[model samples]
Target: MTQHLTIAQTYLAAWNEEDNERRRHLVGQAWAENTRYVDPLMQGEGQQGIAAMIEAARQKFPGYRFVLAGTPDGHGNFTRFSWRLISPDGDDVAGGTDVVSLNTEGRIDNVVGFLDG
Candidate 1:
């Protein structure tokens, strides 16, 4: 269970990577080939699409990085964690929570994200 949470953390951390090749590689390591990601604003399926989704978000929030705001916890093949988008200036610009379903190997199979008000 804890291992799954750790995997979830690393998976989300990959969103901050900007180098195209490295970003894709990291996301691939975090997700299964058929992983699906859905948020209130967007949805994506498969490794390529999921990587594109994170890249598009990076484009929108250029200098910000997603940082873990709380410890991740998991049970029954699912993991959940909170994150904050911190700007280069060290101020938080946004916050959200993500719920992930993991495969037996601890790779992400799907993730549902929610923004915090």
Candidate 2:
């Protein structure tokens, strides 16, 4: 099914959200409370930690929006995808790939990210 792909998109969408409350709500839709995220800049355990990390990122890079770079691909419970951050001037500021594991409930439980040059 495409539910996994949809979840991946939603995960990126959550990061794109500007409002803290809405971002947290969207994260709840995509990640479980026990979700973990690891990337070059930060590591987070649990939804709260992840949410705080995202907020910090927003503060660090204001006026940049994240968007999917390509479709999500996966097998079984694992998914891999890429996303890019675009500046207000439409320049691609940063890009990265993420590997995610989904729980039986179809919520993301683990995510590992790598920056792309």
Candidate 3:
């Protein structure tokens, strides 16, 4: 069985990573080479493009970190989870839910995100 929680955590970790190199490494672990991510505000395709998108987010939200908001669940190759973007002061700056499709090796290959107010 796929470890849905671990997958979600790894995905969030990639987003929270502050260092470019480490973030790229985490992205490589969490996403497939041809992975695609799309949300209301942004979109990314391929590993490098996804890493660049994350780097852009880091630039826009300097001291923010992404955190899991609830337990993640999955069936087969699909997982769904919620997350919060937290500020350095521990305030919730934004929140969203994402549905991800995993590759055979359990790395995410596609993601669809929805923002919540």
What's each prediction's TM-score? 0.91, 0.93, 0.93
Error of 3 at 76 (Å): 0.7
Better of 2 and 3 by lDDT: 3
TM-score of 3: 0.93
Per-residue alpha-carbon lDDT of model 1 for 1-117, expressed as tens digits?
A: 567568666876688787878978887887888789888989999989988888887888788888887688878888888888899899988889989888888678989999985
lDDT of 2 by residue, 29-106 (tens): 788988899999899988878888999989999889878887888899898888888998999988999999989998
Q: Is 1 or 2 the stronger prediction by TM-score?
A: 2
> For residue 34, what is the lDDT in candidate 1?
76
Point to the candidate with the largest lDDT: 3
> Higher-lDDT candidate among 1 and 2?
2
TM-score of candidate 2 relative to the true fold: 0.93
Determine the C-alpha RMSD for candidate 1 after optimal superposition of all C-alphas.
Answer: 1.4
* Sliding window of 10 residues with minimal summed lDDT for model 1: 1-10
Q: Model 1 misses residue 93 by how many Å?
A: 1.5
Return the lDDT, model 2, position 73: 84
Tell me the RMSD of model 2 versus the true structure: 1.2
Residue runs of model 1 more than 4 Å from their true location after superposition:
none
- Tell me which of candidates 2 and 3 scores higher on TM-score: 3
lDDT for predicted candidate 3 compared with the true structure: 0.88
